[model samples]
Target: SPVEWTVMDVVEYFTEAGFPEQATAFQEQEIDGKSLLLMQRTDVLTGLSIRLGPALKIYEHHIKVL
Candidate 1:
């Protein structure tokens, strides 16, 4: 199932509150599940284009996992 959040919802919440320490705590507790929706991978082509405009696809393979 998809998450119950929208991108703007996250942006609004984070913008108002900043990242709480509990965010990491929750991640540590919740991240072990296999169903984690890896948005970076899922939204790669379109999300990059949305953020970077037309130049995104040309550099698709450039980002490295650090």
Candidate 2:
């Protein structure tokens, strides 16, 4: 696997996961795999400026696996 996924990669994940809006927000945040590695559950849920429900799924599915 690659060391870091691009921001576009993040966007793609969000899109495939049915979170187009979160994908945009993540892009605005300039978050890539590099940033993903550093982000915690609390950070993903709270810092992304999105709803708690989506944040929950995102972290559990994406961040947690990473």
Candidate 3:
């Protein structure tokens, strides 16, 4: 489903998705495609140490759909 995307790909996704903060967070955590596919609501909502607004949107609009 992730099309074999890499860590940088994920980072780019966050940035291009209008979440530059999470982009940095993703890169900081070394989140590769596998790690991304394995993410959950809890992970995206809180585990990423980001603000709730971005976290909530990222979870629903991104991780949940992913």
Candidate 4:
């Protein structure tokens, strides 16, 4: 199902899914609103200052699951 998820939801998902560090890192990013999904890899990477490989992996997984 394609459900709307906020940035915090993704962070919580990572945190509860056993990725505490990743969750903490992602939690610092600022997004526009409460109902949205990550749309671009560069945006995510730049916003979070994360590596491409891990950023893409998480983004891909988020798209598929959401």
Ranking under lDDT, best-scoring first? 3, 2, 4, 1
Find the 10 residues in a row with the least total lDDT in model 4.
30-39
What ranking of all candidate models by TM-score puts the best one first? 3, 2, 4, 1
lDDT for residue 43 in candidate 4, whole number 0-100 = 60
lDDT of 2: 0.84
Q: What is the lDDT of residue 31 in candidate 3?
A: 86
lDDT of each: 0.33, 0.84, 0.87, 0.58
Which of the predicted structures, 1 or 4, would earn the higher lDDT when compared with the native? 4
Query: Which wins on lDDT, candidate 2 or candidate 3?
Result: 3
Per-residue CA lDDT of model 4 for 25-65, tens digit only, reads 66676442342253465665666666667767666675334
TM-score of 3: 0.91
Task: Tell me the tens digit of each residue's lDDT in model 2 across 1-66.
Answer: 313789898788788888988888889899887887888888888898998898899899878887
lDDT-superior candidate, 1 or 2: 2
lDDT tens digits, residue span 1-66, model 3 = 574789999999889999987788888888899999999899887788889998999999888887
Q: What is the lDDT of residue 60 in candidate 1?
A: 43
Name model 2 segments beyond 4 Å from true.
none
What residue pairs are clashing in model 4?
none
**Model 3: lDDT of residue 59:** 90
TM-score winner, 3 or 4: 3
Q: Which stretches of candidate 3 lie over 4 Å from their true place?
A: 1-3
